[PDB]
Each structure stands twice: as C-alpha cells, then as structure tokens.
C-alpha cells in the first residue's frame, strides 16, 4: 500500500521517465516546486529588496569607496546572493500561474511552449516591478504583466 517500500519506488521510477514530449517534460519539471502564500511571498519580497539595496551599496562602494573589511564585505555578498535566490524561488513558484494563464491563447500563430516562455518573461518583469508594501496578492499584479 503506502508504507514498507510499496509505492515509493514506483513514484521514483515514474519520476525517472523520458517524457519525450517537451510540453509534458516542462510540466513535470514545473511540478517539483510547492505553491506559496501571502506570508512566503512577502518575506521573499523583503529578501529581494535587501539584495537590491546591498547591490546598490556595493556599486556605490566600487568607485569612491573604502578598502572594505571582510566582516563588512562577506555579509553584503551573502545578502545579495540570498536576495537573488529568493527572487529565483518566487519565479519557480509562480510558473504554474504563468502556464495556467498562457493555456488560453493557443490555437493561433505560435505554439504552446512559445506562449509559456513569453509568459515567463512577463513574470520576470512582474517580479522585477512588484511592490509588497501595497498589501496585494501577487497573482493579481502578475496576471496583467503576463497578459
């Protein structure tokens, strides 16, 4: 049934499958990241804001700066990487919204995967220009940019 090595190996062997169709492979790959909620998205916004601020500080310190000590340099680098990783994480979370939106514009001109990737570009733009302080759910703002 569920336990004693009954179906876990079945799930593993299922996940280790060619899935020669590109759209099905993309759906499988997008399936591996859990959905988020309001709290997770707001602290992700906090993290990316911190990363952007630290990057701007280091850009200012590049020319007309100081010989930055390790304690004042490594922390800034770490928060920059943390912010970039959080941005990435939000994107991989919301690709499902992207594909859900882009499923509707098929049947004319370009193909399903082209629509999906255009929606992905729109999601990049939406995350870059998102604002958490407005206290709105991210899906509503991102839908306009995807469209």
């Amino acid at each position: 049934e569920d336990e004693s090595e009954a179906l876990r190996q079945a799930r593993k062997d299922a996940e280790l499958t060619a899935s020669a169709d590109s759209v099905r492979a993309y759906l499988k790959q997008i399936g591996k990241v859990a959905l988020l909620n309001a709290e997770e998205e707001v602290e992700l916004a906090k993290r990316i804001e911190a990363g952007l601020y630290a990057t701007q500080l280091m850009t200012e310190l590049s020319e007309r700066g100081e010989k930055l000590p390790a304690a004042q340099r490594r922390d800034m680098m770490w928060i920059c990487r943390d912010g970039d990783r959080a941005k990435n994480h939000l994107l991989e979370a919301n690709l499902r919204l992207v594909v859900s939106l882009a499923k509707r514009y098929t049947g004319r001109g370009m193909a399903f995967l082209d629509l999906i990737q255009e929606g992905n570009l729109g999601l990049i733009r939406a995350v870059e220009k998102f604002d958490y302080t407005k206290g709105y759910k991210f899906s509503t703002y991102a839908t306009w940019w995807i469209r």
């Binding site: 590109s22 082209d114 990737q117 570009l121």
Partner: protein
C-alpha cells in the same frame, strides 16, 4: 521553420542576458534544439 528557430534563439539570448532560473533557461534550450531538429528533419523525432 527559420522564423521559429530565430524566435527561440533570440528569446534564449534575452533570457540568459537578463538572468533567469535554470529550469526556464533549460526549457528554452530544449525548445531551440527541437526547433533546429524540426528545421532539418520535421517528424524524425516525436510528432512533426
């Protein structure tokens, strides 16, 4: 076919120059590879 390949390539270069998750970039690369394979042989791999 040539237009499809050009579109995929330009989108991929935009994605890599803008910075994006590796899964997005890999999906774009797979699309580009499939487009080139369709250009030379339409239907040799998968549905045409």
């Amino acid at each position: 076919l040539y237009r499809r390949v050009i579109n995929r390539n330009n989108r991929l270069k935009r994605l890599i120059d803008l910075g994006a998750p590796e899964i997005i970039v890999n999906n774009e690369k797979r699309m580009l590879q499939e487009s080139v394979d369709a250009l030379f042989d339409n239907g040799r791999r998968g549905r045409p």
